[PDB]
Design a protein around this ligand. Sequence first.
Ligand SMILES: *[C@@H]1O[C@H](CO)[C@@H](O[C@@H]2O[C@H](CO)[C@@H](O[C@@H]3O[C@H](CO[C@H]4O[C@H](CO)[C@@H](O)[C@H](O[C@H]5O[C@H](CO)[C@@H](O)[C@H](O)[C@@H]5O)[C@@H]4O)[C@@H](O)[C@H](O[C@H]4O[C@H](CO)[C@@H](O)[C@H](O)[C@@H]4O)[C@@H]3O)[C@H](O)[C@H]2NC(C)=O)[C@H](O)[C@H]1NC(C)=O
Ligand SMILES: *[C@@H]1O[C@H](CO)[C@@H](O[C@@H]2O[C@H](CO)[C@@H](O[C@@H]3O[C@H](CO[C@H]4O[C@H](CO)[C@@H](O)[C@H](O[C@H]5O[C@H](CO)[C@@H](O)[C@H](O)[C@@H]5O)[C@@H]4O)[C@@H](O)[C@H](O[C@H]4O[C@H](CO)[C@@H](O)[C@H](O)[C@@H]4O)[C@@H]3O)[C@H](O)[C@H]2NC(C)=O)[C@H](O)[C@H]1NC(C)=O
Ligand SMILES: Cc1cc2nc3c(=O)[nH]c(=O)nc-3n(C[C@H](O)[C@H](O)[C@H](O)COP(=O)(O)OP(=O)(O)OC[C@H]3O[C@@H](n4cnc5c(N)ncnc54)[C@H](O)[C@@H]3O)c2cc1C
Ligand SMILES: Cc1cc2nc3c(=O)[nH]c(=O)nc-3n(C[C@H](O)[C@H](O)[C@H](O)COP(=O)(O)OP(=O)(O)OC[C@H]3O[C@@H](n4cnc5c(N)ncnc54)[C@H](O)[C@@H]3O)c2cc1C
Ligand SMILES: *[C@@H]1O[C@H](CO)[C@@H](O)[C@H](O)[C@H]1NC(C)=O
Ligand SMILES: *[C@@H]1O[C@H](CO)[C@@H](O)[C@H](O)[C@H]1NC(C)=O
Ligand SMILES: *[C@@H]1O[C@H](CO)[C@@H](O)[C@H](O)[C@H]1NC(C)=O
Ligand SMILES: *[C@@H]1O[C@H](CO)[C@@H](O)[C@H](O)[C@H]1NC(C)=O
Ligand SMILES: *[C@@H]1O[C@H](CO)[C@@H](O)[C@H](O)[C@H]1NC(C)=O
Ligand SMILES: *[C@@H]1O[C@H](CO)[C@@H](O)[C@H](O)[C@H]1NC(C)=O
Ligand SMILES: *[C@@H]1O[C@H](CO)[C@@H](O)[C@H](O)[C@H]1NC(C)=O
Ligand SMILES: *[C@@H]1O[C@H](CO)[C@@H](O)[C@H](O)[C@H]1NC(C)=O
Ligand SMILES: *[C@@H]1O[C@H](CO)[C@@H](O)[C@H](O)[C@H]1NC(C)=O
Ligand SMILES: *[C@@H]1O[C@H](CO)[C@@H](O)[C@H](O)[C@H]1NC(C)=O
Ligand SMILES: *[C@@H]1O[C@H](CO)[C@@H](O)[C@H](O)[C@H]1NC(C)=O
Lengths: 581, 581
Amino acid sequence: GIEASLLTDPKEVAGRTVDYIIAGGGLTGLVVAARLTENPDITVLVIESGSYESDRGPIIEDLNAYGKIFGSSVDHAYETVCLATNNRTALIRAGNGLGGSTLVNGGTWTRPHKAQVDSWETVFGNEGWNWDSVAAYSLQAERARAPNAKQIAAGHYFNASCHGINGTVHAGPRDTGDDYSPIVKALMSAVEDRGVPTKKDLGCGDPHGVSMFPNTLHEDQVRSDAAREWLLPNYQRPNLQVLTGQYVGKVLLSQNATTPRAVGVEFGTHKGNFHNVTAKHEVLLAAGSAVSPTILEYSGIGMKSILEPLGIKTVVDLPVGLNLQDQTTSTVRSRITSAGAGQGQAAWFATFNETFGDYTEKAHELLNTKLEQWAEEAVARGGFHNTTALLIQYENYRDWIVKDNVAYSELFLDTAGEASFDVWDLLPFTRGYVHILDKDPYLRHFAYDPQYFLNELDLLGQAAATQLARNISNSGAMQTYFAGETIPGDNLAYDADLRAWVEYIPYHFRPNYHGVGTCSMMPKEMGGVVDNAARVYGVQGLRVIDGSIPPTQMSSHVMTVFYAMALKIADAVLADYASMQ
Amino acid sequence: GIEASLLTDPKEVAGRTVDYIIAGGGLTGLVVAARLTENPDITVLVIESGSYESDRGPIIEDLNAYGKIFGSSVDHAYETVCLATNNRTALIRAGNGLGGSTLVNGGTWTRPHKAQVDSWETVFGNEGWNWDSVAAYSLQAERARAPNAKQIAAGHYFNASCHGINGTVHAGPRDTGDDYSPIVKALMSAVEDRGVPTKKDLGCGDPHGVSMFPNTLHEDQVRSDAAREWLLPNYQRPNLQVLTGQYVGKVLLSQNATTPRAVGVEFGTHKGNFHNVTAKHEVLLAAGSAVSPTILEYSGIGMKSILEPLGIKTVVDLPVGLNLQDQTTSTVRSRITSAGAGQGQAAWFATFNETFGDYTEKAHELLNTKLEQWAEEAVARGGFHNTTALLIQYENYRDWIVKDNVAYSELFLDTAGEASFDVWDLLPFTRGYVHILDKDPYLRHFAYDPQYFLNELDLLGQAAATQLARNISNSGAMQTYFAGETIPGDNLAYDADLRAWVEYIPYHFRPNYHGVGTCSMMPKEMGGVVDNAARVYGVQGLRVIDGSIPPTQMSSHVMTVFYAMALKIADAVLADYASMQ
Ligand SMILES: *[C@@H]1O[C@H](CO)[C@@H](O[C@@H]2O[C@H](CO)[C@@H](O[C@@H]3O[C@H](CO[C@H]4O[C@H](CO)[C@@H](O)[C@H](O[C@H]5O[C@H](CO)[C@@H](O)[C@H](O)[C@@H]5O)[C@@H]4O)[C@@H](O)[C@H](O[C@H]4O[C@H](CO)[C@@H](O)[C@H](O)[C@@H]4O)[C@@H]3O)[C@H](O)[C@H]2NC(C)=O)[C@H](O)[C@H]1NC(C)=O
Ligand SMILES: *[C@@H]1O[C@H](CO)[C@@H](O[C@@H]2O[C@H](CO)[C@@H](O[C@@H]3O[C@H](CO[C@H]4O[C@H](CO)[C@@H](O)[C@H](O[C@H]5O[C@H](CO)[C@@H](O)[C@H](O)[C@@H]5O)[C@@H]4O)[C@@H](O)[C@H](O[C@H]4O[C@H](CO)[C@@H](O)[C@H](O)[C@@H]4O)[C@@H]3O)[C@H](O)[C@H]2NC(C)=O)[C@H](O)[C@H]1NC(C)=O
Ligand SMILES: Cc1cc2nc3c(=O)[nH]c(=O)nc-3n(C[C@H](O)[C@H](O)[C@H](O)COP(=O)(O)OP(=O)(O)OC[C@H]3O[C@@H](n4cnc5c(N)ncnc54)[C@H](O)[C@@H]3O)c2cc1C
Ligand SMILES: Cc1cc2nc3c(=O)[nH]c(=O)nc-3n(C[C@H](O)[C@H](O)[C@H](O)COP(=O)(O)OP(=O)(O)OC[C@H]3O[C@@H](n4cnc5c(N)ncnc54)[C@H](O)[C@@H]3O)c2cc1C
Ligand SMILES: *[C@@H]1O[C@H](CO)[C@@H](O)[C@H](O)[C@H]1NC(C)=O
Ligand SMILES: *[C@@H]1O[C@H](CO)[C@@H](O)[C@H](O)[C@H]1NC(C)=O
Ligand SMILES: *[C@@H]1O[C@H](CO)[C@@H](O)[C@H](O)[C@H]1NC(C)=O
Ligand SMILES: *[C@@H]1O[C@H](CO)[C@@H](O)[C@H](O)[C@H]1NC(C)=O
Ligand SMILES: *[C@@H]1O[C@H](CO)[C@@H](O)[C@H](O)[C@H]1NC(C)=O
Ligand SMILES: *[C@@H]1O[C@H](CO)[C@@H](O)[C@H](O)[C@H]1NC(C)=O
Ligand SMILES: *[C@@H]1O[C@H](CO)[C@@H](O)[C@H](O)[C@H]1NC(C)=O
Ligand SMILES: *[C@@H]1O[C@H](CO)[C@@H](O)[C@H](O)[C@H]1NC(C)=O
Ligand SMILES: *[C@@H]1O[C@H](CO)[C@@H](O)[C@H](O)[C@H]1NC(C)=O
Ligand SMILES: *[C@@H]1O[C@H](CO)[C@@H](O)[C@H](O)[C@H]1NC(C)=O
Ligand SMILES: *[C@@H]1O[C@H](CO)[C@@H](O)[C@H](O)[C@H]1NC(C)=O
């Protein structure tokens, strides 16, 4: 079926010409590939390092098997540098195969705060990029299902004005057919005692409080990975070709005109064993936030201070690979009474004050006085190039916290036999980088440094949000079900104060795998790599269309935005194509 | 050139018949491939997941660049289970290319104790596998160079009787052109004050004390990796063929009324995309100790209790994957005075009593009383299947310590601007396992658990040897160069006792990447997987020829032994070939 359609021999595409080459068959790459080939006259070649996985079995198709895929050939498992905070190497989970990280992710489907997307036009000078336009694309991608009586009784609320029901990505409530645990409504009641809202639709634009949420799965509970949703219904199109098992190494550039033009790519598996293919219109990079910047650097598009010591000639100088923003995740886990049994997920989207509690005043004071110093320190660490322009970002985050009161941390609850919180600070001020370390793309030798916890507010906020997760687990209605803590358990005294949490947290955290910003969409003079149509500055016919481009984090899970962002970009590509006919 | 001669399209190979198929182009695979094709009538196909790397540049060819290749495409970076000792996953460095881990290793060239190799015949019933035979094969493989006057003045000693000079593997002193650091002879002086010997030739069969050693490199310092030494001189042989970029998935077994026979292998990159090739004589597994046991399991050779829940019919029931033995490595590092400058490596091979110091009586008491209890506990953890058979191994270890006084720990010194010890207990009593977790070989979903520190003497021994490295770093003539400790540094009090070291070591160690034992060469009734000619019990025409088969650890670096082991197996394979003509 679809398996027989995939190309595997490099020689069957080498030296030919297509209209668009898409590097990476993941979330954004497959969305754009489908939109472009709706026109039967447009040819698209997707080149993907992995292969088809959607039909493999529960390890892909059951969202409840989350994490068992880690460490396998479907996980790139990119390795960080030796992190300064704890002198350890960390692993970055990332899907390897058609659908990308939508093959391996938690399936959570929520949207950020309206003011966060709006800042993309007001602060980051991106025409047409605002909550209304992005949300309209989001709803157009969405095919959501309202919850039933069982699901509403568990704790779901669904405002139909905030969801599309006619789109492409199937979404609805996760339901294992088991009973839902009462612990979800117990956590809601526990935060209502503190004046915290509950059951806001996290798709409507003000994610705050404790709520349940849809999941990216079909009603029969099969995972809605981007390949199942966007490629499987369309693979029979003769103008849509997919080459699997090959890495895109570099963009081929014209030597001709005033400014360079992308004319194709080189792809392969090892030095001396690579091939060319030509793009008549454009090359679109969709290899993920950890990779698309490295493809640019291997092609001579990046920072001369990085490329010259490797013997790569710089043809376009841009701050490629900087401004990397990922979050830190920690765990609090507790056994539950027999009364707590049942399925169910929920999350507390907590504000700054809700996160810091007693430390709210001191934290606000740091935020009010340290921005300039913090920016100088991040630039000195190589996380950004221009202190003045980084400060624009920090002033924007302070307005989000102080004037808009957006969610600052996320406390994610799993039940199904226990009470377990994964906790992350949503708005890190640290900035990191990814840079190549060799001229050979197929060696994949690079330095990936998110600089976790090298901003003191990031460490304070993470410690405070995790302490809060212990607090709320044994508070209010949650006391009914509390049966003793197992994480941290013995490793951190149960009455630890914030200082004790700060000492513990660097040795008990994982990456959140939400990395954005390595080809930031903002003006060049602000440190950006792409314009408001995702075009790389100073190069014709070349775009970065994936998680590399969001200039900020957001108080949500990213799929709702990335699906919208891919469709918005597809409209721009098609508009430029049309103007030539 | 060798690059053009390599095969890179799987369809050039699919459907052929050759005499021998070697899975894995690593150390032992390439040695056996070279030996077999000395007869121009014998055809060999090597199938290797990586490609050719020996001409890449310093990152491969300069031993002093050790470690920079980690995390690249030339590094398999196998992830362990989440370890019980510290709730972390660890990474197993393992070379991916022609040459295997000889491409990425430290280059150290030493031999174990005579009694340790003798035990393979005496305890583990492997006729012909004793020090005399293995050493003779080792000298035949070896092409050593005596140290010169500058190198002898630095501390080198070389006994011509213990080294071959007319063989294949180039070996001699590392020499970066710098002055040699006086810290090496200082360390020798410091252990001389305690009656510990120095400058013994660690190739002669009694490795004890502080010595320098040869390195696997040419005189101009190019790394002598297995491909450079065994394949590059011989790639023009028409009967020798090498396929790169492809994984061997499983052995093809006849399925009829008679005993199963290896008739070929299936190889490829993904479940949709694999091929066969036929073996007329034998299939030889050489994919490394972490992989060759999994290839057997994928083929239905292994434990029914593992295979059946995965949907794999058990064709031959063997304890495949058990008895895994890897060591734990920790670091002590300090700054040096200006007078300590220069190049130089040395190692202290320390006996049981030397490592334990004032804890010697208590350590000996544990070793005398707990062997049966420990073997029960290792079996209950799944590291081995038969308690009595494991107790035989433990008695052998106790004899090595009490009656032979073999080296028990190794303290490896690097200088070149600092004083840095990597420390490991050489003889772990813990037993681990590796097992597949899915029936699809190309998913590479497996559980690899060395069970580090889950035996209490292993933890106690590693704590004591690392404390000893701190002690000797500031003792005797070493005091002249001591300029402050940086690791542990602030992370552990400088006057910490053994108990304090025991608390810290589980959170400050790495795998040594010396894992052996997963297809142990011993009698079936002792838990073995292969006989003394490396043939898998119960299967015709199938052998395992790599680091999976040594039944014990050894007090040395293993290259001297693995080259000899490969040469000795080649002779057995060629004797069976002559029997069928
Ligand atoms: C790695 O991570 C794992 C967890 O992921 C850690 O293991 C857990 O450690 C915590 C302690 O930090 C343990 O919690 C304690 O639980 C006991 C009582 O639990 C007993 O009863 C349970 C049901 O009633 C039963 O399921 C348990 O059985 C399991 O555990 C035993 C031994 O742990 C094991 O042998 C079995 O096979 C099962 O796996 C268990 O027998 C309780 O006494 C403790 O209470 C203390 O703390 C509370 C604080 O709330 C305090 O009020 C009390 O006064 C008391 O002092 C504590 O709750 C947990 O059982 C462990 N296992 C699991 C699965 O969670 C492990 O330690 C980590 N390793 C590291 C860090 O190296
Ligand atoms: C991760 O791992 C690294 C090591 O790789 C850890 O960093 C090292 O920490 C140790 C302490 O645990 C430091 O050692 C101390 O050194 C100071 C003085 O060092 C000064 O002089 C050096 C030249 O002689 C100079 O290179 C140093 O500059 C570097 O380091 C500093 C940080 O220290 C940094 O700011 C710079 O930018 C440079 O990177 C520095 O100027 C010394 O005071 C200490 O002496 C103690 O011990 C002695 C005797 O043992 C005792 O008598 C004293 O009372 C005192 O208590 C100690 O030697 C080391 O400098 C750090 N850096 C290295 C080694 O490069 C890091 O902490 C780890 N992070 C973790 C665990 O999170
Ligand atoms: C563990 C985890 C959990 C997550 N959970 C959630 C969640 O609950 N909710 C949510 O909304 N989001 C979640 N996400 C995030 C979401 O899945 C991703 O942000 C999204 O898939 C990223 O899309 P992308 O197009 O930027 O890249 P990806 O989807 O990662 O796709 C990039 C593709 O490029 C391929 N590739 C890489 N290098 C090359 C190369 N050189 N040549 C060719 N192809 C290449 C990769 O194999 C991959 O298929 C999670 C992510 C992870 C890792
Ligand atoms: C970091 C490190 C440092 C070391 N330092 C030293 C040292 O200083 N001194 C010393 O004496 N020894 C050292 N060693 C050990 C020594 O290098 C190895 O033990 C030796 O290379 C092992 O030989 P092998 O044939 O068993 O396996 P390997 O040499 O690892 O060969 C296995 C080969 O099989 C390939 N392969 C894997 N899976 C498949 C598959 N499915 N199909 C086909 N091919 C496959 C691999 O890519 C590899 O080429 C070190 C090892 C490591 C990892
Ligand atoms: C539902 O969503 C729409 C759009 O945000 C809004 O007008 C309405 O107030 C929301 N709430 C309810 C209860 O309808
Ligand atoms: C392939 O890629 C580059 C174009 O920049 C060049 O080396 C070569 O001529 C191209 N064509 C072929 C057939 O290799
Ligand atoms: C949060 O805290 C600050 C200072 O403690 C206070 O001024 C502010 O009104 C609080 N509430 C909100 C919603 O920001
Ligand atoms: C948790 O937070 C509440 C908030 O008022 C506080 O009263 C309580 O002392 C905190 N600690 C615990 C253990 O509940
Ligand atoms: C640094 O950033 C500021 C803010 O965008 C900008 O005005 C200035 O020109 C930038 N400087 C450089 C060298 O890019
Ligand atoms: C050198 O090696 C031989 C063989 O082991 C041995 O007899 C001799 O004593 C060794 N030492 C010296 C100094 O020759
Ligand atoms: C079974 O297969 C083996 C190996 O392929 C072959 O030698 C033998 O003749 C076969 N036996 C029967 C009964 O077909
Ligand atoms: C490969 O082997 C399998 C079974 O061993 C079988 O499908 C086929 O006959 C063989 N050849 C090809 C080309 O698949
Ligand atoms: C080692 O220590 C034990 C006592 O703990 C003693 O019997 C033995 O003689 C010592 N020396 C050697 C070389 O074993
Ligand atoms: C170091 O080792 C020697 C020899 O056992 C011992 O006398 C001394 O107390 C040890 N400790 C220190 C801190 O030197
Ligand atoms: C266990 O091993 C011992 C020693 O080799 C042997 O005598 C015994 O038969 C074995 N038991 C089983 C069940 O294999």
